[PDB]
Amino acid sequence: QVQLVESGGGSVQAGGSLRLSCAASGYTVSTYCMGWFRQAPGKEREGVATILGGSTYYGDSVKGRFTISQDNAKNTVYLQMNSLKPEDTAIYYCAGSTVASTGWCSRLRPYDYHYRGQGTQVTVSS
Known part of the structure; x- marks a missing residue:
């Protein structure tokens, strides 16, 4: 079938960076709108970033710190996260x-998209 596998998460100190990757199987990443959404513990899900070809969109609280990009040769979408804060934990x-x-x-609104991965934890400690 179609599989989306996220990796790159972990536990990092505030101010640090991480790079999440989303590898797609049976689905070409560069032809359709893809994105990342997050869910923080105790809270409702939120849109983080979306991408369609060269066009990119960021949620208002992560704009400037996160970058979404894609690698067509690896069929992978990345989420570069810089200057992480404890509120980014999710x-x-x-x-x-x-x-x-x-x-x-x-x-x-990537939480409305057809395919969704199992998700990867990002824990930021102050």
């Missing part, structure tokens, strides 16, 4: 839609 999920609309991708 499970991060990779997701892939069946849509190739930039307008739709710009709504930053």
Whole structure:
């Protein structure tokens, strides 16, 4: 079938960086809107970043610190996270839609996308 596998998470000190990766199987990453959403413990899910070709979109609290990018040769989508804060602690999920609309991708709602990974924990300690 279609498999999305996230890796790269772990436990890091505040101010540090991490690089999450989302490897897709049976699904080409560069043709459809993909993204990351997170879920912090005790809270509702939130959109983090989305990408469609060269167009990228970021949630307002991570813009400037995170970068989403893709590698077509590895069929992988990355989430570079810089200057991590304790509030960034959460499970991060990779997701892939069946849509190739930039307008739709710009709504930053990757929790509504068809395919979703099992998620990877990011724990930031102060």
